[PDB]
């Protein structure tokens, strides 16, 4: 086998949309808002801080 260095990280669609979502009920975050974060129309915060 070979591999492709994907220059951006990329979500596996099986663990995103298997019904139920594994990333969905792993993050406690709805599948719609995860698809809105992944497809570049909304942001999600990481370590909001003060």
Partner 1 sequence: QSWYLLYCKRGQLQRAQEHLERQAVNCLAPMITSEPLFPNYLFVEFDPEVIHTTTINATRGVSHFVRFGASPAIVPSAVIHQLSV
Q: Is 26 in the site for DNA (CB under 7 A)?
A: no
Separation in Å, CA 27 to CA 2, 5, 6, 21, 42 = 31, 26, 24, 10, 16
Tell the residue number behind the tokens 């129309």, with chain if given.
41
Instruction: Work out whether 32 is an interface residue with DNA (CB under 7 A).
Output: yes
Q: Is 14 in the site for partner 1 (CB under 8 A)?
A: no
**Contact characters 5-24, DNA, x per CB under 7 A:** ------------x-xxx--x
d(CA 14, CA 16) in angstroms, rounded, equals 5
Residue ranges binding DNA (CB under 7 A): 17, 19-21, 24-25, 30-32
């Amino acid at each position: 086998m070979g591999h492709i260095e994907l220059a951006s990280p990329t979500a596996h669609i099986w663990f995103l949309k298997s019904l139920p979502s594994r990333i969905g009920l792993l993050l406690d975050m709805p599948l719609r808002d995860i698809e809105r974060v992944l497809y570049f129309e909304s942001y999600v915060v990481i370590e909001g801080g003060m």
